Amino acid sequence: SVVEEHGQLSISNGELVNERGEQVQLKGMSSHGLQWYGQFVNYESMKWLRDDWGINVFRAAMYTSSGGYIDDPSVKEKVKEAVEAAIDLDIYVIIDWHILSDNDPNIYKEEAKDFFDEMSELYGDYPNVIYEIANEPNGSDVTWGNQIKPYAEEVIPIIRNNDPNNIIIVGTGTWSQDVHHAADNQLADPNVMYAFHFYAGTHGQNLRDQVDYALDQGAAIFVSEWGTSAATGDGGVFLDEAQVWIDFMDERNLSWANWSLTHKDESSAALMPGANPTGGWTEAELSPSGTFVREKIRES
Ligand SMILES: O=[N+]([O-])c1ccc(O[C@@H]2O[C@H](CO)[C@@H](O[C@@H]3O[C@H](CO)[C@@H](O)[C@H](O)[C@H]3O)[C@H](O)[C@H]2F)c([N+](=O)[O-])c1
């Protein structure tokens, strides 16, 4: 009864709060690309995550390029499937317009406006939905002030015409690490959060201090993607540094989604090769990363 209990989420003094104004922290999993590992996104696997891991949020990672939505728009129906399951399971859900190689969110802004118009029209009267309008803006030529903020200022109005106050997570520069620039030039909408993403393979002490700087400007931060691996999503599992970030996020009441729910042979993948796509995973079907993430959510 997560959604029944906390209901409408909003931002108050830079903090995510429930409909009674109490601080709330969401912890869950992100899918991998829906064009590749969509079979792991379904009511049964999400229910298993809710019941056995304790998740209270699920992130649907709809890549735009890399064979995603722009090339084959059918993947938007898998996002709808995930939203409907979240509604049925009474958990929160993030709709992620998962830009990456298409590094400037303006490249597909017309399609983004059409997609968010459709999703907000369909689901704008449910409290479960969180819109993430540009996963990871990246590149030296893509800045908050010149590219990202103006993009958000075109897409947010589209959403707001159908859904006036569900949370919107807006990506930041340098693969959603540059929360410092965003916090110094914040968007006007009162229910916006800025995305901050990390990988435990990178020594993170300055990045933690940067998140703190942003929080100190009154900006709300959602860690909508993080991994136990290196920044490529592979290269080793770094559980000591991941624990430091877990403790940091708890102290700052930061919500998060781990990357990712797939059996792909890479360190950040939570599942091993024989894991059933509909859940019920034994200890051996979880990777070293999945075992750790499951423990962190169960402990919460
Ligand atoms: O340098 N960084 O800080 C940084 C941070 C984040 C990041 O990218 C992000 O974080 C992971 C790990 O890099 C990416 O997932 C990886 O996407 C690859 C390309 O689709 C897949 O082949 C790989 O299986 C998958 O795990 C997510 O799409 C992307 F949001 C990347 N990146 O993709 O290069 C770089």
Curated annotation (Swiss-Prot):
Q: What is its EC number?
A: 3.2.1.4
Top-rank EC class of the record's enzyme: hydrolase
Which GO terms fall under biological process for this protein? cellulose catabolic process
Q: Which cysteines are joined by disulfide bonds?
A: none
Record's catalysed reaction(s): Endohydrolysis of (1->4)-beta-D-glucosidic linkages in cellulose, lichenin and cereal beta-D-glucans
Q: Which UniProt keywords apply?
A: Carbohydrate metabolism, Cellulose degradation, Glycosidase, Hydrolase, Polysaccharide degradation
Q: Which residues form the active site?
A: 136, 225
> Keyword Hydrolase on this protein?
yes
Citing just one GO molecular function, the answer is: carbohydrate binding
Binding residues for substrate: 32, 36-37, 63, 98, 199, 231-232, 259, 264-266
**Homology family:** Belongs to the glycosyl hydrolase 5 (cellulase A) family.
This chain belongs to the protein called Endoglucanase B
